[PDB]
Amino acid sequence: QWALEDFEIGRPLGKGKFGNVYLAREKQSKFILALKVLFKAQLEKAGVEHQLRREVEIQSHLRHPNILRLYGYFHDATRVYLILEYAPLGTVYRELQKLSKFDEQRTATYITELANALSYCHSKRVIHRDIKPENLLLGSAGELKIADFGWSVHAPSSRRATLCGTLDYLPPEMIEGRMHDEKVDLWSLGVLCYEFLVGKPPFEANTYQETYKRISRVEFTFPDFVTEGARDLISRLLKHNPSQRPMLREVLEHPWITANSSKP
């Protein structure tokens, strides 16, 4: 249905592991979008051609405002292109670099948006598994938008791919290879909530190795400026036992969320 010759390419919007993402416009309609280009060679070598295929299948069938739209795809002899909705305010990663840390209002708001989009996903039994500030995009109204469904799967699940990124967001059961379900996303939600208020994820280290330890032991400590209500929500999400983590309603109605989150 599509080829490259229908789009005017522009500035690179960003980069991740397998190829750049580019601002682009559809010549006929004048639609602005983001084009995610992946090189086939690299997807063959790293053994992740399936991840990309699911990325496309899961994501195309998802309609919620706090989730990035995939409108389609096409491929060349050497490259795969995904036609994405374009997030003009960039990433939550960049915002965190500018501002160092977020206030409780911004945090509780982002968390709210997150939980909602996760509620939606978990209602179709879909787990994201890669909730990272680099994949949380900001739309024109400043609203959060989950991107990157490369790692997303149908729950429950086991890991059949060597996660070779930072483990900062991953809970114990997923690094330990052990099975897992939608509870994985609630652990990630607490790491984010920590990182937003503190700036840095709560198990950061100069090695993957120590990061593993700290995760499996659940060793985090809060700076003095984190308030009781924030501490309670974070402590409630970062439990080793996935069964003991709350439901997404319990997040949404948590006192600290309701008092700081700015709903529509």
Ligand X SMILES: O=C(O)c1cc(-c2cccc(Br)c2)nc2ccccc12
| Residues flagged as binding site for ATP | 17, 36, 85-87, 134-135, 148
Half-sphere exposure of residue 155: CA atoms within 13 angstroms, side-chain side: 17
The single residue among 8, 17, 49, 97 that binds ligand X, judged by CB under 6 A, is 49
Which of the choices ligand ATP, ligand X, Mg ion, none does residue 18 contact, using the CB cut-off of 5 to 8 A by kind?
Answer: ligand ATP
* Nearest-angstrom CA–CA distance, 133 and 74: 27
Phi-psi region of 167 (alpha: psi -120 to 50; beta: other; left: phi over 0): alpha
Joined tokens for residue 241? 């036992």
Interface pattern 40-79 for ligand ATP (x via CB under 6 A): ---------------x------------x-----------
Q: How many helices (H) and strands (E) does the chain have?
A: 10, 9
Interface pattern 93-122 for ligand ATP (x via CB under 6 A): ------------------------------
Contact 67, 60 (CB under 8 A): no
* Nearest-angstrom CA–CA distance, 228 and 223: 11
Joined tokens for residue 85? 């909705």
Applying CB under 6 A, the span of 5-13, 44-52, 230-238, 256-264 interacting with ligand X comes to 44-52
Joined tokens for residue 231? 């501490």
- If binding is defined by CB under 6 A, does position 151 make contact with ligand X? no
Q: Which residues contact 225 (CB under 8 A, 6 or more apart)?
A: 197
The single residue among 6, 26, 134, 143 that binds ligand ATP, judged by CB under 6 A, is 134
Q: Does the annotation count 232 as an active-site position?
A: no
* Smallest distance, Mg ion to C-beta of residue 130, A: 7
Contact 117, 69 (CB under 8 A): no
Catalytic residues: 130
Using CB under 6 A as the criterion, which residues of the chain lie in contact with ligand X when the complex forms?
40, 43-44, 49, 52-53, 56, 73, 75, 80
Binding site for ligand ATP (CB under 6 A): 13-18, 21, 34, 36, 55, 68, 84-87, 91, 134-135, 137, 147-148, 150
Please give the residue ranges that form the binding site for Mg ion (CB under 5 A).
Answer: 16, 134-135, 148
